[PDB]
Design a protein around this ligand. Structure first.
Ligand SMILES: CCCC[C@H](N)P(=O)(O)O
Ligand SMILES: [Co+2]
Ligand SMILES: [Co+2]
Ligand code: NA
Length: 262
């Protein structure tokens, strides 16, 4: 049930991927102390709809009431935007976007540091991105996804942090969440060999503290059990003949779009 994309399919994901990356690049100037998450959400939505002529995949998904996910500090993921939640100096915030264009999905997220960063915040964001980059560098045909989850874990743990088990990367295409489940840790349950034409996301969530998490009464919001800060980055990629191509690459990414093995 793992869908293999045709080249035409891939051309469309490249567009959707770029659109999604673009929302992230666009929003940056608005991320400042005093802005509410509800306003960031509206700016995004407007852009998506009125400028891009695309659609947010989040709006209505299983009942999701907003256009993007905004997770502050200890919120792990799926934080709900709100007019009352204002950003302060030193906050670390994840903005997660998923756009639909020509029926294809593009899913990506990045951390933003509000005003003057904290040492921990900065550190955690860095290590989290590096862990995603590490995984990307390993992607190529013939390798088992298991090896990827394991390298991520090993890296993160050596850096004194913890990896969230409960949520993971996923296949993506015409469908928002397709097979397979991309675990960010070492698990004997994982046994998936990569092949060209496969499209999925890698989106490790790392905790400054302990790995444990808790779901809010809102049924969306996830927070760390120990209230420590949590960070995440996400990219959508396609497995190529000799490596991978990052479909959601941004101007600020410091990794090449095409990774080649030889
Ligand atoms: C409404 C659920 C939002 C899904 C997230 N973009 P992900 O698939 O990265 O967890
Ligand atoms: Co995703
Ligand atoms: Co996402
Ligand atoms: Na967070």
């Amino acid at each position: 049930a793992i869908s293999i994309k045709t080249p035409e399919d891939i051309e469309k994901m490249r567009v959707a991927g770029r659109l999604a990356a673009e929302v992230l690049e666009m929003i940056e100037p608005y991320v400042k102390p005093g802005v509410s998450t509800g306003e960031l959400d509206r700016i995004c939505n407007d852009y998506i709809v009125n400028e891009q002529h695309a659609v947010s995949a989040c709006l209505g998904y299983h009942g999701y009431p907003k256009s993007v996910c905004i997770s502050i500090n200890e919120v792990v993921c799926h934080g709900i935007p709100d007019d009352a939640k204002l950003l302060k100096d030193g906050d670390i915030v994840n903005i997660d976007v998923t756009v639909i264009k020509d029926g294809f999905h593009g899913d990506t997220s990045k951390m933003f540091i509000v005003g003057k960063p904290t040492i921990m915040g900065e550190r955690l964001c860095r290590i989290t991105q590096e862990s995603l980059y590490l995984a990307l560098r390993m992607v190529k045909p013939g390798i088992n996804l298991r090896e990827i989850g394991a390298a991520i874990q090993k890296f993160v743990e050596a850096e004194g942090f913890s990896v969230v088990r409960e949520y993971c990367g996923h296949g993506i295409g015409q469908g928002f969440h397709e097979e397979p489940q991309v675990l960010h840790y070492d698990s004997r349950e994982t046994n998936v060999v990569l092949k060209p034409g496969m499209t999925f996301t890698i989106e490790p969530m790392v905790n400054a503290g302990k790995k444990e998490i808790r779901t809010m009464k809102d049924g969306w919001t996830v927070k760390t059990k120990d209230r420590s800060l949590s960070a995440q980055y996400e990219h959508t990629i396609v497995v190529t003949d000799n490596g991978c191509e990052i479909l959601t690459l941004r101007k600020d990414d410091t990794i090449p779009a095409i990774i080649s093995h030889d």
